[PDB]
Structure formats: structure tokens, C-alpha cells
Coordinates of C-alpha atoms and ligand atoms in Angstrom, one line a residue:
Chain A
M1 CA 155.3 103.2 79.2
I2 CA 153.9 100.5 76.7
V3 CA 151.4 98.2 77.2
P4 CA 151.6 95.1 79.6
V5 CA 152.3 91.9 77.5
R6 CA 150.0 89.8 79.3
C7 CA 148.3 90.3 82.6
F8 CA 150.0 90.2 85.8
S9 CA 147.7 88.0 87.8
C10 CA 146.1 85.6 85.6
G11 CA 148.0 85.3 82.4
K12 CA 145.7 86.4 79.5
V13 CA 148.0 88.4 76.7
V14 CA 147.0 91.9 76.8
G15 CA 149.7 93.3 74.5
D16 CA 147.6 93.8 71.8
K17 CA 144.3 95.1 72.9
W18 CA 145.8 98.3 73.5
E19 CA 145.4 100.2 70.2
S20 CA 142.0 98.2 69.7
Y21 CA 140.5 99.4 73.3
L22 CA 142.2 103.2 72.7
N23 CA 139.8 103.0 69.3
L24 CA 136.7 101.8 70.2
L25 CA 137.3 104.9 72.7
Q26 CA 137.8 107.9 70.5
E27 CA 136.3 106.6 67.6
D28 CA 133.5 104.1 67.8
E29 CA 132.7 106.5 71.0
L30 CA 132.1 103.6 73.7
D31 CA 132.4 103.8 77.3
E32 CA 135.7 102.3 78.8
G33 CA 133.7 99.7 81.1
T34 CA 132.4 98.3 77.7
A35 CA 135.1 98.8 75.4
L36 CA 137.1 96.5 77.8
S37 CA 134.2 94.0 77.6
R38 CA 134.3 94.1 73.8
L39 CA 138.0 93.2 73.8
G40 CA 137.3 90.0 75.6
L41 CA 138.7 91.1 79.0
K42 CA 136.2 89.1 81.6
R43 CA 137.6 89.0 85.1
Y44 CA 138.6 92.4 86.7
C45 CA 142.2 91.3 86.9
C46 CA 143.1 91.5 83.3
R47 CA 140.3 94.1 83.2
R48 CA 142.2 96.4 85.6
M49 CA 145.3 95.7 83.6
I50 CA 144.2 97.7 80.6
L51 CA 142.0 100.3 82.3
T52 CA 144.5 101.7 84.4
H53 CA 147.8 101.5 82.4
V54 CA 149.4 105.1 81.6
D55 CA 151.1 104.9 78.1
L56 CA 153.8 107.6 79.4
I57 CA 156.2 106.2 76.4
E58 CA 154.0 108.4 73.9
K59 CA 155.5 111.3 76.0
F60 CA 159.1 110.0 76.1
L61 CA 159.1 109.6 72.4
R62 CA 158.1 113.3 72.1
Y63 CA 161.7 113.9 73.0
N64 CA 164.6 113.7 70.6
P65 CA 167.8 111.9 69.8
Chain B
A1 CA 182.3 102.8 60.0
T2 CA 183.4 103.2 63.5
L3 CA 182.4 106.1 65.8
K4 CA 183.7 107.3 69.6
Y5 CA 181.3 109.7 70.7
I6 CA 178.1 111.4 69.7
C7 CA 176.0 115.1 70.5
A8 CA 173.5 115.5 72.9
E9 CA 170.9 117.6 70.3
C10 CA 172.4 117.0 66.7
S11 CA 173.0 113.2 67.1
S12 CA 176.0 113.1 64.9
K13 CA 179.0 110.6 65.6
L14 CA 182.4 112.3 66.1
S15 CA 185.7 110.7 67.3
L16 CA 188.4 112.3 69.0
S17 CA 191.4 112.3 71.5
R18 CA 193.2 114.4 73.6
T19 CA 194.0 118.4 72.6
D20 CA 190.9 118.7 70.1
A21 CA 188.9 120.1 72.9
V22 CA 185.3 118.5 73.6
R23 CA 183.0 120.6 71.4
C24 CA 181.3 119.6 68.2
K25 CA 181.2 120.6 64.4
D26 CA 178.6 123.4 63.8
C27 CA 176.5 123.7 67.4
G28 CA 178.8 124.0 70.3
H29 CA 176.7 122.2 72.9
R30 CA 180.0 120.9 74.4
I31 CA 178.1 117.7 75.7
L32 CA 178.5 114.4 73.9
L33 CA 177.7 110.8 74.6
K34 CA 180.0 107.9 74.2
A35 CA 177.9 105.2 71.6
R36 CA 177.4 101.7 72.5
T37 CA 179.8 98.7 72.6
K38 CA 181.3 96.7 69.7
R39 CA 180.6 93.5 71.8
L40 CA 177.0 92.9 71.9
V41 CA 175.8 92.3 75.3
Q42 CA 173.4 89.6 75.9
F43 CA 170.1 89.4 78.3
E44 CA 168.5 86.7 80.6
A45 CA 164.7 86.7 79.2
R46 CA 163.0 86.5 82.5
Chain C
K1 CA 177.2 150.1 83.7
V2 CA 179.0 147.9 86.1
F3 CA 178.9 144.1 86.9
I4 CA 178.5 143.2 90.6
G5 CA 178.4 139.3 90.9
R6 CA 175.9 136.8 89.7
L7 CA 172.4 136.0 90.9
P8 CA 171.4 132.4 91.1
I9 CA 168.0 132.3 89.1
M10 CA 164.7 130.3 90.2
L11 CA 163.8 128.1 87.3
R12 CA 160.1 129.1 85.9
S13 CA 160.7 132.6 87.1
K14 CA 160.6 135.7 84.9
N15 CA 164.0 135.9 84.6
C16 CA 164.2 131.8 83.3
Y17 CA 163.9 131.2 80.0
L18 CA 161.7 128.3 81.0
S19 CA 159.2 130.6 81.9
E20 CA 158.0 131.7 78.6
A21 CA 158.3 128.5 76.5
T22 CA 155.5 126.0 75.5
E23 CA 155.2 122.1 75.5
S24 CA 157.2 121.3 72.5
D25 CA 159.1 123.9 73.2
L26 CA 160.2 122.3 76.3
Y27 CA 160.3 118.9 75.0
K28 CA 163.0 120.6 72.8
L29 CA 165.2 122.0 75.8
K30 CA 165.0 118.3 77.3
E31 CA 162.9 119.7 80.1
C32 CA 160.3 117.6 81.2
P33 CA 157.1 119.6 80.7
Chain D
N1 CA 152.5 87.1 106.3
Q2 CA 152.1 87.6 109.8
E3 CA 153.1 90.5 112.0
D4 CA 153.2 93.0 109.0
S5 CA 154.9 90.7 105.9
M6 CA 153.2 89.8 103.1
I7 CA 152.9 87.0 100.6
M8 CA 153.2 87.9 96.7
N9 CA 152.2 86.2 93.7
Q10 CA 155.5 84.9 92.0
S11 CA 154.1 84.2 88.7
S12 CA 153.0 88.0 89.0
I13 CA 156.5 89.1 89.7
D14 CA 157.4 87.3 86.3
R15 CA 154.9 88.8 84.3
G16 CA 156.7 92.1 85.5
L17 CA 154.6 92.9 88.4
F18 CA 156.1 95.6 90.6
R19 CA 159.7 95.5 88.8
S20 CA 161.4 98.7 88.6
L21 CA 164.6 100.3 87.0
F22 CA 167.6 101.6 89.0
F23 CA 170.2 104.1 87.8
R24 CA 172.9 105.7 89.3
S25 CA 175.9 107.8 88.4
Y26 CA 179.4 108.5 89.2
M27 CA 181.3 111.7 88.3
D28 CA 184.9 113.0 87.8
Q29 CA 187.1 115.6 86.9
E30 CA 190.8 116.6 85.9
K31 CA 192.3 118.5 88.5
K32 CA 194.5 121.3 87.4
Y33 CA 197.4 122.7 89.3
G34 CA 198.2 126.6 89.2
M35 CA 201.6 126.2 87.5
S36 CA 200.5 123.8 85.0
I37 CA 200.2 119.7 86.3
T38 CA 197.0 117.7 85.4
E39 CA 195.5 114.6 85.7
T40 CA 194.3 112.0 82.6
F41 CA 191.6 110.0 82.0
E42 CA 193.5 106.6 80.5
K43 CA 194.0 103.3 81.3
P44 CA 196.8 102.8 83.2
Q45 CA 199.4 99.7 84.2
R46 CA 202.0 99.5 87.0
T47 CA 204.2 102.0 85.5
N48 CA 206.3 102.8 88.9
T49 CA 203.2 103.6 91.2
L50 CA 201.6 100.3 91.6
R51 CA 198.6 102.8 93.5
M52 CA 196.0 100.8 91.2
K53 CA 192.9 98.8 92.7
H54 CA 191.9 95.1 93.0
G55 CA 189.5 95.2 90.3
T56 CA 189.8 94.6 86.6
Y57 CA 190.6 97.5 84.2
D58 CA 190.0 95.5 81.1
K59 CA 186.4 96.9 80.7
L60 CA 188.3 100.2 80.3
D61 CA 188.6 101.8 76.7
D62 CA 191.3 103.9 76.5
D63 CA 189.8 107.3 76.8
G64 CA 189.7 105.8 80.4
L65 CA 186.2 105.2 80.1
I66 CA 183.6 102.2 79.6
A67 CA 181.2 101.7 76.5
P68 CA 177.6 101.8 77.1
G69 CA 177.1 98.7 76.6
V70 CA 179.3 97.1 79.1
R71 CA 178.0 95.0 81.8
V72 CA 180.0 96.0 85.0
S73 CA 179.8 94.2 88.7
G74 CA 182.1 93.8 91.8
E75 CA 184.4 96.7 92.1
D76 CA 185.2 96.7 88.4
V77 CA 186.8 100.1 87.4
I78 CA 184.3 102.6 85.7
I79 CA 186.7 105.3 85.4
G80 CA 190.7 105.4 84.6
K81 CA 192.3 108.7 85.8
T82 CA 195.7 109.5 86.7
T83 CA 197.6 112.0 88.8
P84 CA 201.3 113.0 88.2
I85 CA 203.6 113.7 91.4
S86 CA 207.4 114.3 92.4
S87 CA 205.2 108.3 87.8
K88 CA 201.4 107.1 87.8
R89 CA 199.4 107.5 91.1
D90 CA 196.0 106.3 90.5
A91 CA 192.3 108.6 90.6
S92 CA 190.4 105.7 88.8
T93 CA 186.5 105.2 90.2
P94 CA 185.5 101.8 90.4
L95 CA 181.6 100.6 90.5
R96 CA 180.1 100.5 94.0
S97 CA 181.5 97.3 95.9
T98 CA 177.5 96.3 96.6
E99 CA 176.0 97.3 93.2
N100 CA 176.3 95.8 90.1
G101 CA 174.4 96.3 86.4
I102 CA 175.1 97.6 83.0
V103 CA 176.8 100.9 81.8
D104 CA 173.8 103.0 80.5
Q105 CA 175.0 106.2 79.4
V106 CA 178.5 107.7 79.9
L107 CA 179.1 111.6 78.9
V108 CA 182.1 113.4 78.2
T109 CA 182.2 117.2 78.6
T110 CA 184.3 120.4 79.8
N111 CA 184.1 122.4 82.6
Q112 CA 184.3 126.2 83.0
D113 CA 187.7 125.7 83.7
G114 CA 188.6 123.8 80.3
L115 CA 189.1 120.6 82.5
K116 CA 187.7 117.4 81.0
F117 CA 184.4 116.5 83.0
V118 CA 183.0 113.2 82.7
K119 CA 179.8 111.4 84.0
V120 CA 178.9 108.0 84.1
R121 CA 175.7 106.1 84.7
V122 CA 175.2 102.2 85.6
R123 CA 171.7 101.0 85.1
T124 CA 169.9 98.2 86.9
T125 CA 166.4 96.4 87.0
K126 CA 165.4 95.4 90.1
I127 CA 162.7 92.2 91.0
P128 CA 160.7 92.2 94.1
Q129 CA 162.6 89.5 96.0
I130 CA 161.6 88.3 99.7
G131 CA 162.8 91.2 102.0
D132 CA 161.6 94.0 99.7
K133 CA 159.2 96.4 101.2
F134 CA 155.9 97.7 100.2
Chain E
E1 CA 132.9 54.8 79.3
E2 CA 135.0 53.3 82.3
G3 CA 136.2 56.0 85.1
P4 CA 136.4 59.8 85.5
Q5 CA 134.0 61.5 82.7
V6 CA 133.7 64.7 81.1
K7 CA 130.7 66.5 79.6
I8 CA 132.3 69.5 77.3
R9 CA 129.6 72.3 77.5
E10 CA 130.8 75.1 75.4
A11 CA 134.2 75.4 73.2
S12 CA 136.2 77.2 71.2
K13 CA 139.5 78.5 70.2
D14 CA 140.3 79.9 73.7
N15 CA 138.5 78.1 76.1
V16 CA 136.8 74.8 77.2
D17 CA 134.0 75.1 79.7
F18 CA 133.7 71.2 80.4
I19 CA 132.2 69.2 83.3
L20 CA 134.7 66.8 84.5
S21 CA 132.7 64.3 86.6
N22 CA 133.3 60.9 88.6
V23 CA 136.8 61.9 89.8
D24 CA 138.4 63.0 93.0
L25 CA 138.6 66.4 94.2
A26 CA 142.4 65.4 94.6
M27 CA 143.0 64.4 91.2
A28 CA 140.7 67.4 89.7
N29 CA 143.3 69.8 91.6
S30 CA 146.2 68.2 90.5
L31 CA 145.3 68.2 86.9
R32 CA 144.1 72.1 87.6
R33 CA 147.6 72.6 88.9
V34 CA 149.6 70.9 86.0
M35 CA 147.9 72.8 83.5
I36 CA 148.7 76.0 85.2
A37 CA 152.2 74.9 85.9
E38 CA 154.2 72.0 84.4
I39 CA 153.0 71.6 80.6
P40 CA 156.4 72.4 78.2
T41 CA 156.2 75.2 76.0
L42 CA 158.7 77.6 73.6
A43 CA 159.4 81.0 74.8
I44 CA 162.1 83.4 73.9
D45 CA 164.9 82.9 76.7
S46 CA 168.0 84.9 75.4
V47 CA 168.3 88.3 73.7
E48 CA 171.3 89.6 72.3
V49 CA 171.2 93.2 71.5
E50 CA 173.4 95.0 68.8
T51 CA 171.4 98.0 68.9
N52 CA 168.7 99.8 70.6
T53 CA 167.8 103.4 70.4
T54 CA 164.6 103.2 71.7
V55 CA 162.9 104.8 74.6
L56 CA 163.0 101.5 76.7
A57 CA 166.0 99.9 78.2
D58 CA 167.4 96.5 77.0
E59 CA 166.1 94.7 79.6
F60 CA 162.9 96.0 79.7
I61 CA 162.6 95.0 76.4
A62 CA 163.9 91.6 76.7
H63 CA 161.2 90.9 79.5
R64 CA 158.6 91.3 77.1
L65 CA 160.1 89.2 74.2
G66 CA 160.1 86.3 76.8
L67 CA 156.3 87.2 77.4
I68 CA 155.6 87.0 73.7
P69 CA 153.7 83.6 73.2
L70 CA 155.1 81.4 70.4
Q71 CA 153.8 78.6 68.4
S72 CA 154.3 75.6 70.3
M73 CA 152.5 72.6 68.8
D74 CA 155.2 70.2 68.0
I75 CA 157.1 71.6 71.1
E76 CA 157.2 68.1 72.3
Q77 CA 159.8 67.3 69.5
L78 CA 162.3 69.9 70.6
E79 CA 164.8 68.9 73.2
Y80 CA 165.9 71.1 76.4
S81 CA 169.1 72.7 75.7
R82 CA 170.3 71.1 79.0
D83 CA 169.7 67.7 77.4
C84 CA 171.0 68.6 74.1
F85 CA 174.2 67.8 73.4
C86 CA 175.3 71.1 71.6
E87 CA 178.0 73.3 73.3
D88 CA 175.2 75.6 74.3
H89 CA 172.3 75.6 71.6
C90 CA 171.2 74.2 68.0
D91 CA 168.1 73.8 66.0
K92 CA 167.7 70.7 67.5
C93 CA 166.4 72.4 70.9
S94 CA 166.0 76.1 69.8
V95 CA 164.3 78.5 67.5
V96 CA 166.0 81.8 66.8
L97 CA 163.9 84.8 65.8
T98 CA 165.3 88.2 64.3
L99 CA 163.8 91.6 65.0
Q100 CA 164.6 94.9 63.4
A101 CA 163.1 98.3 63.3
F102 CA 163.7 101.9 61.9
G103 CA 161.8 105.2 62.6
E104 CA 161.2 105.5 59.0
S105 CA 157.9 107.0 59.3
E106 CA 157.8 110.7 60.0
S107 CA 155.5 109.4 62.7
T108 CA 155.8 107.2 65.4
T109 CA 156.9 103.6 64.0
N110 CA 155.4 100.7 65.7
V111 CA 157.2 97.1 66.3
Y112 CA 155.1 94.1 66.6
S113 CA 155.1 90.3 67.8
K114 CA 154.8 89.9 64.2
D115 CA 158.0 91.6 63.0
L116 CA 159.9 88.7 64.6
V117 CA 161.6 86.6 61.6
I118 CA 162.8 83.1 62.6
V119 CA 166.1 82.2 61.1
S120 CA 166.9 79.1 62.4
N121 CA 165.8 75.6 60.6
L122 CA 162.8 74.1 62.0
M123 CA 163.6 70.9 60.7
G124 CA 159.8 70.8 59.3
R125 CA 157.6 71.1 62.7
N126 CA 155.1 73.8 64.1
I127 CA 157.1 76.1 66.6
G128 CA 158.3 79.4 67.1
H129 CA 155.8 81.3 65.1
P130 CA 154.4 84.4 67.1
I131 CA 151.2 83.8 68.1
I132 CA 148.8 86.3 66.9
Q133 CA 145.1 86.6 67.5
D134 CA 144.8 90.5 67.1
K135 CA 142.4 91.6 64.6
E136 CA 144.9 93.4 62.2
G137 CA 147.1 90.4 62.4
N138 CA 150.1 92.2 64.4
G139 CA 149.7 90.6 67.9
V140 CA 151.5 92.1 71.1
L141 CA 153.2 95.7 70.6
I142 CA 156.4 95.4 71.6
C143 CA 157.5 98.8 71.5
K144 CA 157.7 102.1 69.6
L145 CA 160.4 104.5 68.1
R146 CA 160.4 108.3 66.9
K147 CA 162.6 109.8 64.0
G148 CA 165.5 107.7 63.7
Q149 CA 165.5 105.4 66.4
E150 CA 166.8 101.8 65.8
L151 CA 166.5 98.3 67.5
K152 CA 168.5 95.3 66.3
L153 CA 168.1 92.0 68.4
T154 CA 168.3 88.3 68.1
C155 CA 166.1 85.8 70.2
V156 CA 166.6 82.3 71.4
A157 CA 163.7 80.4 72.3
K158 CA 164.2 77.3 74.3
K159 CA 161.9 74.8 75.9
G160 CA 160.5 74.7 79.4
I161 CA 157.5 75.0 81.7
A162 CA 155.9 77.5 84.2
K163 CA 157.7 76.4 87.4
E164 CA 161.1 77.8 85.8
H165 CA 159.0 80.7 84.8
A166 CA 155.6 82.3 84.0
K167 CA 156.1 82.8 80.6
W168 CA 156.4 79.3 79.7
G169 CA 152.5 78.8 81.1
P170 CA 149.9 78.2 78.5
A171 CA 147.6 78.5 81.4
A172 CA 146.3 81.9 81.2
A173 CA 143.3 81.3 84.1
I174 CA 141.4 78.5 85.2
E175 CA 138.2 78.3 86.4
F176 CA 137.0 75.7 89.0
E177 CA 134.1 75.0 91.0
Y178 CA 132.3 72.2 92.8
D179 CA 129.2 71.5 95.1
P180 CA 127.5 74.8 94.2
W181 CA 124.6 74.3 96.7
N182 CA 126.6 74.0 99.6
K183 CA 125.7 70.5 100.4
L184 CA 129.1 68.8 101.5
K185 CA 129.2 72.0 104.1
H186 CA 132.8 72.5 102.7
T187 CA 132.3 76.2 103.8
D188 CA 130.0 78.6 106.3
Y189 CA 128.7 81.7 104.4
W190 CA 129.5 84.7 106.2
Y191 CA 126.5 87.1 106.4
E192 CA 124.3 90.0 107.9
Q193 CA 120.9 88.5 107.8
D194 CA 120.5 85.6 105.1
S195 CA 123.0 83.6 103.7
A196 CA 121.0 82.5 100.7
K197 CA 119.7 86.1 99.8
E198 CA 123.2 87.5 100.3
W199 CA 125.5 85.2 98.5
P200 CA 125.0 85.4 94.6
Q201 CA 124.0 82.0 93.3
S202 CA 126.6 80.5 90.4
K203 CA 125.6 79.6 87.0
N204 CA 126.3 76.2 87.9
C205 CA 123.6 75.8 90.4
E206 CA 121.5 74.9 87.2
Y207 CA 123.3 71.8 86.4
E208 CA 122.6 70.5 89.7
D209 CA 119.8 69.3 91.9
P210 CA 118.6 71.9 94.7
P211 CA 118.8 71.5 98.5
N212 CA 115.2 70.6 99.9
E213 CA 115.4 71.9 103.6
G214 CA 113.6 69.0 105.1
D215 CA 116.3 66.5 104.4
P216 CA 118.7 66.1 106.9
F217 CA 122.5 66.7 106.5
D218 CA 124.3 64.1 104.2
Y219 CA 127.4 63.3 105.7
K220 CA 128.5 60.5 103.7
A221 CA 128.4 63.1 101.1
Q222 CA 131.5 63.4 98.7
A223 CA 133.0 66.0 96.1
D224 CA 132.3 64.4 92.4
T225 CA 131.4 66.6 89.3
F226 CA 133.6 69.8 88.7
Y227 CA 133.0 72.6 86.7
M228 CA 136.3 73.9 85.2
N229 CA 136.8 76.4 82.5
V230 CA 140.5 76.0 81.1
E231 CA 141.4 79.2 79.1
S232 CA 144.4 79.4 76.8
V233 CA 147.0 82.0 75.6
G234 CA 147.6 80.4 72.3
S235 CA 151.0 78.5 72.5
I236 CA 149.0 75.5 72.5
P237 CA 145.4 74.3 71.5
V238 CA 143.0 74.6 74.3
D239 CA 142.3 71.4 74.0
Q240 CA 145.8 70.6 74.4
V241 CA 146.1 72.6 77.7
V242 CA 144.0 69.8 78.9
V243 CA 145.3 66.8 77.5
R244 CA 148.9 67.5 77.6
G245 CA 148.2 68.7 81.3
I246 CA 146.7 65.1 81.7
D247 CA 149.7 63.6 80.1
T248 CA 152.3 65.4 81.8
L249 CA 150.4 64.5 85.4
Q250 CA 150.7 61.1 83.7
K251 CA 154.5 60.8 83.2
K252 CA 155.0 62.5 86.5
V253 CA 152.9 59.7 88.4
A254 CA 154.8 57.5 86.2
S255 CA 158.3 58.0 87.2
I256 CA 157.6 57.4 90.9
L257 CA 156.6 54.0 89.7
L258 CA 160.2 53.5 87.7
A259 CA 162.3 55.2 90.0
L260 CA 160.5 53.0 92.7
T261 CA 162.2 50.2 90.6
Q262 CA 165.9 51.1 89.8
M263 CA 165.4 50.8 93.6
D264 CA 164.6 47.4 93.7
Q265 CA 167.7 46.3 92.3
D266 CA 169.5 46.6 95.6
Ligands
ZN301 ZN1 144.2 89.0 84.2
ZN302 ZN1 177.1 119.4 67.7
ZN303 ZN1 170.8 71.7 71.1

């Protein structure tokens, strides 16, 4: 269900960090807690933002017309 | 150039009217959607 | 030999097509996995 | 925020916090009459009956339906139907008076009895506002 | 120099940790607010949709397009559509982007902040360029599409501020602390045994003189020195988020005088 452009609570964009984050994960094999930090996501508001998103859309796409 | 309907599976434009049933050319799958409007719709962006 | 009416089937039961189908199989049937 | 009511961050409501989609679907058929008499999915006008509806019919195409992009509201007519009886007594379906939104997906088909079966679906986004529950 | 004063510690393209001192909590705060809510900016505020075979809904997509930060340097030289004289809008008060995507690939095709193509004349001025800080140079993933999914829009950015809506805030977040060694006694730490042991000390304690038990309570005390850290989203240069803030707040107090004059006439 797509990555939230900008964090609800404070405002920092987060629209881009998705792919990055999903990468420092399966490739660079880091642990979430850090990956986020690498991505500049300090305070937990913006932090819970990425760490919790469920990118449903990927399933949504697996449909058809 | 201009369309009226579409098929659920074989997403293929149709266009009909009364009498010619409500099926499709090839696969029966007698559903069919109704393709967007020509007069584009506008949205607030908030 | 003779037909005696219709018996409503339960989804995901043996007699139901979905019983066998797989992910991709389903997504194609438009059924949420 | 007293007595079980809360204060919500408006800013957050804007950045998309707690918004949701809402769909709704009106349905309809073309009734048959044993010794051949049927209804019609069309956009009527007077023509004897006057049995119309207060709301606008204009958002209606000629198949007696609305194009998936059209925005509806008050009691606009979503479906056009008529019944002949002894010339045009109405049978059209208008959008639920309270609601409003945007047509999302109109579907045309036939039922077992070769009946013209149609299903419309209007879509809306609902935003957390003062009276809402959480 | 003269009055209130800064001591910018750290600093960058997205932050300005500084030390505004010799002011009034009151005034520090006001500045703090204005930065968050009343600095003009350019944001997408209208979206016509010609086509959308996306898995997302029209307004779903629009919501985000408005969230996408846009270049607002010369924003102060673009008028508010409300003020402009054009029946509706024009290049004198609005930027018009375009967006189009097609599932060309045989594998999930993305759509990015970058894909917006300005189409109105910018009468030469920094405005409406989708702000990108993303490594690959894409910025904000608007949405994705499968096989033959399409999407044809048209956006119209207009001026605007945070009050009217959040997408106009260039703020993002704003750190603010003062009197790290509870001296003014503007608090009362909760505790189980020792307040001091139980409550973390802030990095700001260093930049300031410790307590010294013996000493009596200083009632004449007052709040000076505020350790603030003004982030930014990019729509505007961190430094500017501060100046333009100081500047707006300034205009605000201004009008009060001005109006307080047009009144004198009678
Ligand atoms: Zn945040
Ligand atoms: Zn077909
Ligand atoms: Zn204008």
C-alpha cells in the first residue's frame, strides 16, 4: 500500500527511503534498527513510519487488468 | 478511437447496444466494465 | 444416471476449484490468496 | 480530551494519518414478465409518466449508466430504468441521499434468465474529523 | 552585536543546530511556530486525471502529489491565485507539471517525484522543480504499475502556507530546549528515588553552567538562551526556513501597526 510520502507526525519526507531501506536489508544485510538510522531517520516518529509500513501494493500488482 | 465497454479478464475494448447480448469476442466471461469518462475529473490535492 | 438438484458448495472444500489452486493460480482467478 | 474523547494532530491528518477509502455498490436488474414485457436501462424524460425523480439525470449516459469517472452527490441518478404498464413509469436508482463521491466501477452483465444485470460502485475517501471514533 | 544573538553550532543542507540567546522565551517560541506554520511555499494543489489504470485510487494519488516537496526558492515572487487577477490561474501565480507512466517493462515499472515535467513558463525563477535528495536521483516514489497500467495527470502548484494545509510546511520538525539544568524550576521531575539519576541529562547541559547545591534558589532568574534545531524538507534552504520565518513573523507584527493606522483616520 505504497510508502508514505512524508511522515505523519513530524514532516520529514520518507517517500524515497523505501527502496534504500529494503536494500540495506536483503543485500547489505543489516538489521532494521540500523538500516533506518543509516537512512537519516533519527526520532521514532519518522522511524516507526518506515519500520512498520506494509507495502501491500506489491500484492495488489500481482493481479491483472 | 472511442470505446464503451471492456472485459474483466481479456481487457479488450468493446462497444455495444441493445440486442447483441452482453458477452465478448473469444472468451465468454460475460462480465464487462464500463471504461472511464471522457470529461476528465479534477481533484483537490489536500 | 439422474439429476436431483444442486448442492451449494463451500469455498476451499474438495469439490471447490480453489481447493487445489496455488498463489499465482488464485491471483489469476481474482481470488485473494 | 475529557470524558473519553481525544485530541488529534491536525497536521498528521493532512499527511494522511488515519484516512480511509469507502466503497458502496447499488445493484439492479431488468424484470421480465412471463408473457413478454420487460424494463429498460435508458435515460428517460417525461414521456407520459412524469414518474421521474427530483435529482438530476444528466450524469446519465444512454445505456442508462454513469461513466466511471463522474462525480455524483445529493440524489443524482446513478441508474436509469423504466417499466412499461397499461408509457414510462420510472425504476431508476439514485445515490443514497446522505452520501456522495465518485463513480468507481460500473459493471454490465446478464443473469441466468438472460436479464440485463448491472452493478455500480461509488468511491470516497473519508478523513478523520471531530466526531469520529477510534 | 546589538540585541538577540545566535551561535550556530552545527549546520548543513538539512539542519541548523544553533543557539539563539538574549531574547524572550515568548519571542523564541513565536519564531518556532512561524517556521512550522506560516512560511509560503509551492505545493501541488490541483490534479486533473485523464487516465489511471493504477492499483491506487485517483484521490489516493492526488494526496501524495501534494505531499511531494517542490522547489520554492523564488516562491516570494509568485502570487497567490486568490490575489492574482486571472479567472482561475496562470504563470503569474502557478506552476503546471505533467505526469505520465506506462507499464512498459515486463516487470513493475515505478513512477517518481522526478517524472513530473513542468509545462508552464517559469518566467525564469526557481520554482516547481520536484526536490530530490534521493541517492539514485529519483525522489519520492509516487506509485507502481504492472503490465499495461497507465496514468496521465496534470498538476497545478499554487502558493500557500502550513495553516491552510500541512503540505505547505517547509518545517519538518523543530528541536527546542532551554535551561537544561532545571534552575528556573519550570518543571518538577517525576521520580522513584533520585530525580537526577533517573532523568537523562541533555547534550545541552555542557553548553551551560552546572547547579552547585549550596546556593539558594535564584528567583530573579529568567529564560535566556534557547537551543534550537530547525530541520527542513528542501522546499526551502534550511537557513531560509529561519530567516523567512524571522521575516514573516516580522511582517505579521508589521500589519498590526499598519492597520492600527488606517484606523486613526477616523
Ligand atoms: Zn517523523
Ligand atoms: Zn472477453
Ligand atoms: Zn494567476
